Amino acid sequence: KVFGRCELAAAMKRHGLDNYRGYSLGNWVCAAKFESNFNTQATNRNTDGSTDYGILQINSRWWCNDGRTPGSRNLCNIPCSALLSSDITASVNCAKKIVSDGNGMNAWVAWRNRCKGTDVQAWIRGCRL
Ligand SMILES: [Cl-]
Ligand SMILES: [Cl-]
Ligand SMILES: [Cl-]
Ligand SMILES: [Cl-]
Ligand SMILES: [N]
Ligand SMILES: [N]
Ligand SMILES: [N]
Ligand code: NA
Ligand SMILES: [Pt+2]
Ligand SMILES: [Pt+2]
Structure with a gap:
């Protein structure tokens, strides 16, 4: 499944x-x-x-x-x-294990290089949460 941003x-x-x-x-x-x-x-x-x-x-x-x-x-x-499921449960549960692992989100190369230190709030701007 391809998610929408706010979805x-x-x-x-x-x-x-x-x-x-x-x-x-x-x-x-x-x-x-x-x-x-x-x-x-x-x-x-x-x-x-x-x-x-x-x-x-x-x-x-x-x-x-x-x-x-x-x-x-x-x-x-x-x-x-x-x-690879449309249900992201497994991915989320595994990601929680990863980010607890001591390096935090730096484990995701794209996060380190494209998200870290940017205005990340913009990614949820406009959504009903
Ligand atoms: Cl959406
Ligand atoms: Cl889900
Ligand atoms: Cl979960
Ligand atoms: Cl951290
Ligand atoms: N979901
Ligand atoms: N959940
Ligand atoms: N969960
Ligand atoms: Na393995
Ligand atoms: Pt869900
Ligand atoms: Pt959950």
Whole structure:
């Protein structure tokens, strides 16, 4: 599914991401914009053979199992395919684990390079929340 901006903000809010670990909702929407263009089915393969999955482009080396990333850990205990669902629950639950992990949202390269230090509130401007 390809989410609308405000549609995704509402979904993320419902699943508890607003101000999770101190990161306002705009941050999460901005990260999803630039990671996947709000498309839950997005996948991207990395040089190291790992693959990134879903709206938040969660990586198979650490977080999910895709059966083709040797000696990977599956810290969210899910198949990577679960992250491609129109229901973003699995992605949100895994992202909460990631951002608690000590590096915060810097774990998302697009967030660090395109969202961090910008006016991220603009991403939820105009939405009914
Ligand atoms: Cl929308
Ligand atoms: Cl949802
Ligand atoms: Cl959730
Ligand atoms: Cl942090
Ligand atoms: N939720
Ligand atoms: N949740
Ligand atoms: N949802
Ligand atoms: Na893995
Ligand atoms: Pt939902
Ligand atoms: Pt939830």
